[PDB]
């Protein structure tokens, strides 16, 4: 004698994919700073968090199949483009350039690194001449024959970045629609997959900074109580390893040259910002890292790889295997200037079981972001000297070699994907759909 | 292109013989490949000058085909075949490559006896 009773509002959820919506704080919203990740879209965020802890609850996570990371990738790309739409398009810059080396005050380290180029142009009127010049970096010009052209001419014409917009990452919060929930894993020992005994639910995620980097994760969130190593198929060789630090390593970067701007007029109401001329002497850009606090950190990373790779295996670190400058170098931008720096000084050692390091960097102004083809961007020059300081919170590593069962392991820096930079933040979160109807047996009957 | 020089200052030719006068150019004088801008004029005594050859090989209308010119890129010469009494005069080579345009110094021709 048992009859079906139907309940509405039961706490049951199921894995699902849905379109999250962005939220942001009001500091930039109140004054219209116009960041690339503009607040015009994201709604004002809640005045305070409303997280709820769930006792007795166990849930199965997987950081590597998360739909959140894919939905963040597309939106970051889309928000980037819509910011570049109104800006002037530098189609008239594809002419023949006549360039000569700058010889005034040059450090031997960068003989012939930037050039003094001149070319014909029109003024604000269609039918009047104008001859202009500008300094260009050697990576942006390719010889055609002492005649050159910009690297991008034979593929596409790309848009100058509007001077009043900024690339600085402001945190953006990802909040779930009605009928859905976000489960956050609070386990300190989590390895990115398997059950999480300390689940809790939150209205929506913490502030995430959309930083762009390679071979090193900058301005991120630190692990707790121990360095963490996350990989899905650790015994592979085509699977990257994500390392998260428990204490930052500080990196300082600078571009000592004192550059000067020059606003050229090309067409009605359009301007081109040339590099003018440099005050002082030309020197190499570089970044600094502490020799003591960096090899005190590699000693903590190795002691975790010793777990996955034997108690007496001899580890080894080496520089990038090769490829394009965007993948073999620690790329980033600070102060609106794009850096491509040589990390061969850091990944060089063997572990057998002040003297701050300097990394020389090269600058560029023709930018191909998101690994797309046929679409670049031109970075206007920045007045004065620029400097920046940032945390280092993680590495992207790629193993190689299978010649022996276990004698040594050689690790090199990665950079073959961009979602890796955001799987380091969205690893605690997952989205679930709520199914509130349930039927259970109990002794009851419909009277009458 | 500034200065042009002609090698023979005076020339004597027996009737029935051929004649040759060469004009030397300081600079290229060639625009590109097919075009050479040199011309040859004659100023018979007590008369106005006259056009004989232009573009360094082309012959003017009304000029008997005994006048033939050849040369390119800083070497030119005007040939007359079986010269006649009326060939006495003075010949100037003119260059049209770059302003100001200049004349040669002049080669003087006389019937031999």
């Amino acid at each position: 004698n048992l009859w079906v009773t139907v309940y509405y509002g039961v706490p049951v959820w199921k894995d699902a994919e849905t379109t999250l919506f962005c939220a942001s704080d009001a500091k930039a919203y109140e004054t219209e700073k116009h960041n690339v990740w503009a607040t015009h879209a994201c709604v004002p965020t809640d005045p305070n968090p409303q997280e709820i802890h769930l006792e007795n609850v166990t849930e199965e996570f997987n950081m590597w199949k998360n739909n959140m990371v894919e939905q963040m990738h597309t939106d970051i790309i889309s928000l980037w483009d819509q910011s570049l739409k109104p800006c002037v398009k530098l189609t008239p810059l594809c002419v023949t350039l006549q360039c000569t080396n700058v010889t005034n005050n040059i450090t031997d380290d960068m003989r012939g690194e930037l050039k003094n180029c001149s070319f014909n142009m029109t003024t604000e009127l269609r039918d009047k001449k104008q001859k202009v010049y500008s300094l260009f970096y050697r990576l942006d010009v390719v010889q055609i024959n002492k005649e050159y052209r910009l690297i991008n001419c034979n593929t596409s014409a790309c848009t100058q970045a509007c001077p009043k917009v900024s690339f600085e990452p402001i945190p953006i919060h990802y909040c779930a629609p009605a009928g859905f929930a976000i489960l956050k894993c609070k386990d300190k020992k989590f390895n990115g997959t398997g059950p999480c005994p300390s689940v809790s639910t939150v209205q929506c995620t913490h502030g995430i900074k959309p930083v762009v980097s390679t071979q090193l994760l900058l301005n991120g969130s630190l692990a707790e109580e121990e360095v963490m190593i996350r990989s899905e198929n650790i015994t592979n060789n085509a699977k990257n390893i994500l390392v998260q630090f428990n204490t930052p390593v500080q990196i300082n970067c600078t571009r000592p040259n004192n550059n000067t701007r020059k606003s050229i007029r090309i067409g009605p109401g359009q301007a081109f910002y040339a590099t003018g001329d440099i005050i002082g002497d030309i020197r190499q850009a570089h970044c600094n890292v502490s020799k003591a606090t960096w090899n005190e950190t590699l000693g903590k990373v190795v002691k975790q790889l010793r777990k996955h790779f034997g108690n007496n295996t001899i580890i080894r670190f080496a520089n990038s295997s090769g490829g394009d400058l965007e993948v073999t170098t620690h790329s980033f931008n600070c102060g609106g200037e794009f850096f491509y720096c040589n990390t061969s000084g850091l990944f060089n050692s063997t572990w057998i079981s002040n003297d701050s390091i300097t990394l020389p960097c090269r600058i560029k102004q023709i930018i191909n972001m998101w690994q797309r083809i046929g679409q670049c961007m031109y970075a206007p020059p920045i007045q004065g000297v620029i400097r920046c300081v940032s945390n280092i919170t993680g590495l992207i590593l790629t193993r190689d070699g299978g010649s022996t069962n276990s004698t040594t392991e050689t690790f090199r820096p990665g950079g073959g994907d961009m979602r890796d930079n955001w799987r380091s933040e969205l690893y605690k979160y997952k989205v679930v759909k709520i199914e509130p109807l349930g039927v259970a047996p109990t002794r009851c009957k419909r009277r009458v | 292109d500034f200065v042009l020089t002609q090698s023979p200052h005076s020339l004597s030719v027996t009737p029935g013989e051929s004649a040759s006068i060469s004009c030397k150019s300081s600079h290229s004088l060639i625009h590109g490949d097919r075009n050479n801008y040199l011309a040859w004029y004659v100023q018979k005594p007590g008369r106005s000058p006259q056009l004989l050859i232009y573009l360094a090989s082309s012959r003017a209308s009304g000029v008997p085909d005994r006048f033939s010119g050849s040369g390119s890129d800083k070497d030119f010469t005007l040939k007359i075949s079986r010269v006649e009494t009326e060939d006495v005069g003075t010949y100037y080579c003119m260059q049209g490559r770059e302003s100001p345009w200049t004349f040669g110094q002049g080669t003087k021709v006389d019937i031999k006896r």
Partner: protein, 123 residues
Amino acid sequence: LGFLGAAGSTMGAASMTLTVQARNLLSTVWGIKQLQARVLAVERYLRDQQLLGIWGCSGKLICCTNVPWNSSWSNRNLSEIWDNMTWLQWDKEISNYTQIIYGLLEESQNQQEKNEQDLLALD
């Protein structure tokens, strides 16, 4: 005490908080996101409301039905269910048998609608 908080507690203790979950089921080309999302929310809520409405449970959070509980579905004693089990466990045991049950609930309803109308007509 808050939204979804009783997900790990006994089944009987979880049913005391149905209202907390019940309240939260509802609330330029780039921004069509914030419109696609809301329309979806409305039509999902209306699907559950209709599904209850054609069972006889128009506005009831805990609605009784006359459908006998086939023992082949689950064999537990009521103490084994309402005291020492969680709703996220019960979902695992009945998932296969769920789709058919909504049929029996729907079959039993219109029978009453036809029956009661006849009994009123008998007046």
